[PDB]
């Protein structure tokens, strides 16, 4: 057939690019850039350099302290054996305090290490937030990447710090494992009567499906007009060429309305952020306001009603 533009057939090298000049008073960039042939088959081949200033070092100290703690407790749970660590790795975890301790600080091997790791991971993510903000603002760009990051951090803090405090127990938070955190997911659905009848859960699922749909559509459309220079979106925005025109006619003819080369990126932004906004809203109300989502859905006229034919006798009533 015709070239599909999925891999780079011919590669070219020039000396590495150090980066746009920073404002005066900045630290130098660390690292000497290297090139990857395999990364260059699909994208850009340069790796590095990297910018390490004040906020991105405090972050990376916090995060690595947290990682050391989590790893060592997982390793103590098998008796220090690395062979068993590799053998049973998906079943290990660091577990939260027993719920009877409330919001106090428990002893170290009965939930205090969980508390330490949570605190250090929190600080890591807030320092990283400041780094992302300043990096985009020192180059003179809008700070749109910090708004979305803030939303994600808020969801991490909701399930984990805010909801456990509003409930009165640290033992309501997830543990640090793979299968352990999957077990937490299932159990919190079972305890509060079926998350499928949580309406914010349904809306966030709507927006996660929509993210996949929209990004398949956009990735397809821009690869399909890259023969007319469509992959260069900044120029198509500030001087509309034939690639943008064809891209917008396609969708107009197909489904009756369209966006522009700049507006589709606002649709992307919002579809990714409403998913997490509804995530926060659905978790923050569970347990603190609603105790059984299925009974809520029945009270508000939402759940179907299968035919019965039988009678089952509740043995606690007999």
């Amino acid at each position: 057939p015709e070239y599909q533009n999925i891999f780079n057939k011919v590669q070219v090298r020039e000396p590495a690019y150090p980066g746009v000049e920073l404002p005066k008073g900045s630290l130098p960039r660390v690292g000497k850039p290297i090139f990857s042939y395999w990364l260059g088959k699909i994208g850009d081949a340069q790796i590095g350099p990297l910018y390490l200033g004040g906020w991105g070092i405090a972050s990376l100290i916090s995060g690595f302290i947290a990682l050391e703690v989590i790893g060592l407790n997982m390793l103590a749970s098998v008796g220090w054996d690395p062979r068993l660590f590799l053998k049973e790795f998906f079943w290990l975890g660091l577990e939260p305090p027993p719920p009877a301790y409330g919001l106090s600080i428990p002893p170290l091997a009965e939930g205090g290490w969980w508390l330490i790791a949570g605190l250090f991971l929190t600080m890591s993510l807030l320092l990283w937030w400041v780094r992302v903000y300043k990096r985009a603002k020192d180059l003179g760009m809008g700070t749109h990447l910090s708004w979305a990051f803030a939303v994600a951090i808020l969801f991490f803090l909701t399930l984990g710090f805010i909801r456990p405090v509003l409930m009165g127990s640290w033992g309501e938070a997830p543990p640090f494992g793979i299968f352990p955190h999957l077990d937490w997911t299932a159990a919190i659905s079972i305890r509060y009567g079926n998350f499928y009848y949580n309406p914010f859960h349904g809306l966030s699922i709507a927006f996660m499906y929509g993210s996949a749909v929209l990004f398949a559509m956009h990735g397809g459309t821009i690869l399909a007009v890259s023969r007319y220079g469509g992959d260069r979106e900044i120029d198509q925005i500030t001087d509309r060429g034939t690639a943008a025109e064809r891209a917008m006619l396609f969708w107009r003819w197909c489904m009756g309305f369209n966006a522009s080369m700049e507006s589709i990126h606002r649709w992307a932004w919002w579809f990714a952020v409403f998913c997490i906004i509804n995530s926060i809203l659905g978790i923050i109300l569970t347990g603190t306001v609603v105790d059984n989502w299925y009974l809520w859905a029945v009270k508000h006229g939402v759940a179907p009603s299968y035919p019965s034919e039988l009678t089952i006798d509740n043995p606690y009533l007999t």
Binding site: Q11, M261, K299
Partner: protein, 257 residues
């Protein structure tokens, strides 16, 4: 009692209403941003009169892009540059009918061969230099061995005939990668072909261009200066190759089954 009810109104309900209203309102703003290009639209009336309409919701107020290196201001939604001179005949006498090109379809600029009217300036780097340039002007580039160097190969043209030979590679300095191949055609002109319309076979040492035919490489649009390319010229070249996807053979626009 298993399903006893204490009170009908709760917080989850109100919050859900608030969300329905917060969506339903970003739709409004995004739909308004969608109409900074291509509007007001042209509605054709009962007996052919055309008016400008604007849709629902209405168009936003204009905003300004300030382009770098004194590249001017762009207001959007704003004026438009004038279309060129396409000729078309309608096929059926109603507003929703299709059109046919009047002359030679390859040299008409209608259908998949239409193009836009951009600036007559090159695209720039962050330093002020032209962005897309031949590899003899950019003296620091090199093709990575492990990859077939296309310089020298031939340009078979979709009906098996030869179009010409590759003589240069055009690179992109802002993001290092190949954008165009330059070739000498059958009548000894220098023409470009986009790299995203070329299948390169290293062992056969061929480049297959499925879009147009071999004799069609003589009429590809040419450049003013061969040390740079402008936005307008990019559009013209690419559009000429795109017209062949429907006009090269008389059987290409003719219902597969």
């Amino acid at each position: 009692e298993f399903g006893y009810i204490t009170q009908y109104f709760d917080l989850a309900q109100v919050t859900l209403w608030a969300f329905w209203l917060s969506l339903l309102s970003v739709i409004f703003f995004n739909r308004r941003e969608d109409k900074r290009e291509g509007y007001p639209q042209e509605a054709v009336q009962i007996f052919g009169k055309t008016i400008l309409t604007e849709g629902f919701p209405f168009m936003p107020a204009p905003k300004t892009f300030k382009l770098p290196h004194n590249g001017g201001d762009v207001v959007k939604p704003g004026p438009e540059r004038p279309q060129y001179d396409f000729k078309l005949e309608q096929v059926d006498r109603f507003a929703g009918a299709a059109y046919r090109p009047v002359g030679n379809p390859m040299l008409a600029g209608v259908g998949p061969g239409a193009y836009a009217v951009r600036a007559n300036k090159p695209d720039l780097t962050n330093a002020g230099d032209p962005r897309i340039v031949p590899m003899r002007v950019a003296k620091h580039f090199a093709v990575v061995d492990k990859d077939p160097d296309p310089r020298g190969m031939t340009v078979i043209g979709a009906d098996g005939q030869v179009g010409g030979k590759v003589t240069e590679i055009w690179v992109d300095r802002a993001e290092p990668q190949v954008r165009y191949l330059e070739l000498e055609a059958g009548n000894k002109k220098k023409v470009l072909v986009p790299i995203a319309l070329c299948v390169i076979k290293g062992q056969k040492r061929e480049v297959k261009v499925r879009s147009i035919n071999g004799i069609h490489f003589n009429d590809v649009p040419t450049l003013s200066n061969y040390d740079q390319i402008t936005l307008a010229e990019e559009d013209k070249v690419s559009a000429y190759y795109g017209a062949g996807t429907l006009y090269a053979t008389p059987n290409r626009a003719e219902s597969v089954l």
